[PDB]
Design an enzyme around this catalytic site. Structure first.
Site, short mmCIF file in Angstrom:
data_model
loop_
_atom_site.label_atom_id
_atom_site.label_comp_id
_atom_site.label_asym_id
_atom_site.label_seq_id
_atom_site.Cartn_x
_atom_site.Cartn_y
_atom_site.Cartn_z
N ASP A 35 -3.43 6.01 -3.75
CA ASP A 35 -2.82 5.24 -2.68
C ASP A 35 -3.56 5.52 -1.38
OD1 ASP A 35 -1.21 3.85 -0.90
OD2 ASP A 35 0.54 5.14 -1.15
N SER A 199 -10.76 -7.79 9.93
CA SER A 199 -11.39 -8.90 9.25
C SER A 199 -11.76 -9.98 10.26
CB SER A 199 -10.43 -9.47 8.20
OG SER A 199 -10.95 -10.65 7.61
N1 U1H Z 1 0.69 2.30 0.28
C1 U1H Z 1 1.42 3.10 1.25
C2 U1H Z 1 1.94 2.25 2.41
C3 U1H Z 1 3.26 1.84 2.45
C4 U1H Z 1 3.72 1.08 3.51
C5 U1H Z 1 2.86 0.72 4.53
C6 U1H Z 1 3.35 -0.13 5.70
F1 U1H Z 1 4.19 -1.10 5.24
F2 U1H Z 1 4.02 0.67 6.59
F3 U1H Z 1 2.27 -0.67 6.33
C7 U1H Z 1 1.53 1.12 4.50
C8 U1H Z 1 1.07 1.89 3.44
N1 U1H Z 2 2.88 1.86 -1.45
C1 U1H Z 2 3.19 3.11 -2.13
C2 U1H Z 2 4.04 2.79 -3.37
C3 U1H Z 2 3.46 2.80 -4.63
C4 U1H Z 2 4.23 2.50 -5.74
C5 U1H Z 2 5.57 2.18 -5.60
C6 U1H Z 2 6.42 1.85 -6.83
F1 U1H Z 2 6.17 0.58 -7.26
F2 U1H Z 2 6.11 2.73 -7.83
F3 U1H Z 2 7.75 1.94 -6.53
C7 U1H Z 2 6.14 2.18 -4.34
C8 U1H Z 2 5.38 2.48 -3.22
#
Ligand code: U1H
Ligand code: U1H
Length: 330
Positions: A35, A199
């Protein structure tokens, strides 16, 4: 040193990707969601409330001879989709595709939200944003990438996500056989802790390219592409019968439609997302309404280049002292 690991979609829609990670001595192998939008390495464990575990592989620190409890440290995270988890912290040896870090903070979940419990294929997350977002208290902890940086041949990692197919995360080197053409690099702002970039515009199908600055984050941890309302309206306007559904929570389209491609700009270069990548299938089993892969960011507050966009490219996360993002066609 370098590391290389295969990443695999968890279902037929590419909702998320899991990559095997070795934790502890002897190795316990867990399949983690890499992530770039978060900065905690956390895992289902023997400490997780038993009713909140449903098929996940758990980390058992008591069976690792290199695990050490980090006295008094705790963690708690909330993701943009409303998911959350929390627990205590160990340090242990962590290896990804041959690349080993000792003393990595491994955050052991004591509690997880229902969205994680119901996702039996994801054993945890491996955060790859900047370490300023790590939630460990009272002493903030570094990401896997940050810990590995000094030993990597080059301070980079690359994401090569597959469309309905396996892909690769590489650490420390750029596979010049994995992309076509040149890599176009663009500036990154770390002020919010994300891989944030701008972008240069977009096109819908074969339409004219619109030069306009779209600030957003490169986030392997988010499934869809979240863009400003004006952009998303222009895309779905080209799909006969598409509409925004409040009950469903976004744009839906008749499953019989053919979707146009979507192009986004990286400097003077162009990344083309094939229309088929934007189809996320029926909203419910048997439905003839299908869920769209491009949705509005208006409710989120930030634009997100999630998997829908990233899997159309070879993506370089350059963690040099001035960080940059690189995009190439593939
Ligand atoms: N993948 C993690 C993540 C979850 C939420 C956000 C947001 F919505 F806050 F931009 C960014 C990154
Ligand atoms: N953006 C981070 C994230 C990754 C996976 C999940 C889920 F799908 F496993 F719940 C939620 C949030």
């Amino acid at each position: 040193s370098t590391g290389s690991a295969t990443t695999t979609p968890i279902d037929s829609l590419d909702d998320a990707y899991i990559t095997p990670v070795q934790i502890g001595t002897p190795a316990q192998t867990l399949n983690l969601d890499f992530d770039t939008g978060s900065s905690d390495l956390w895992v289902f464990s023997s400490e997780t409330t038993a009713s909140e575990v449903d098929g996940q592989t758990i980390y058992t620190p008591s069976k690792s001879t290199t695990a050490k409890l980090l006295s008094g440290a705790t963690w708690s995270i909330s993701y943009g989709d409303g998911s959350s988890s929390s627990g205590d912290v160990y340090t242990d040896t962590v290896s990804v595709g041959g690349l080993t870090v000792t003393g990595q903070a491994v955050e052991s979940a004591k509690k997880v939200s229902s969205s994680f419990t119901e996702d039996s294929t994801i054993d945890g997350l491996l955060g790859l944003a900047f370490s300023t977002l790590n939630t460990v208290s009272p002493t903030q902890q570094k990401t896997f990438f940050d810990n590995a940086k000094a030993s990597l041949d080059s301070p980079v990692f690359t994401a090569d996500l597959g469309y309905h197919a396996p892909g690769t995360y590489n650490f420390g080197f750029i596979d010049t056989t994995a992309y076509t053409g040149s890599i176009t690099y663009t500036a990154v702002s770390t002020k919010q802790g994300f891989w944030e970039w701008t972008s240069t515009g977009y096109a819908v199908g074969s339409g004219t390219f619109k030069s306009t600055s779209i600030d957003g984050i490169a986030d392997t941890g988010t499934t869809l592409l979240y863009l400003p309302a004006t952009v998303v309206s222009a895309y779905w306007a080209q799909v006969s019968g598409a509409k925004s559904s409040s009950s469903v929570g976004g744009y839906v389209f008749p499953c019989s439609a053919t979707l146009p491609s979507f192009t986004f700009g990286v400097g003077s270069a162009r990344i083309v997302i094939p229309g088929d990548y934007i189809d996320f299938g029926p909203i419910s089993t048997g439905s003839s309404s299908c869920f769209g892969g491009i949705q509005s960011s208006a409710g989120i507050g930030i634009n997100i280049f999630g998997d829908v966009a990233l899997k159309a490219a070879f993506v370089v996360f350059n963690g040099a002292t001035t960080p940059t993002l690189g995009f190439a066609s593939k």
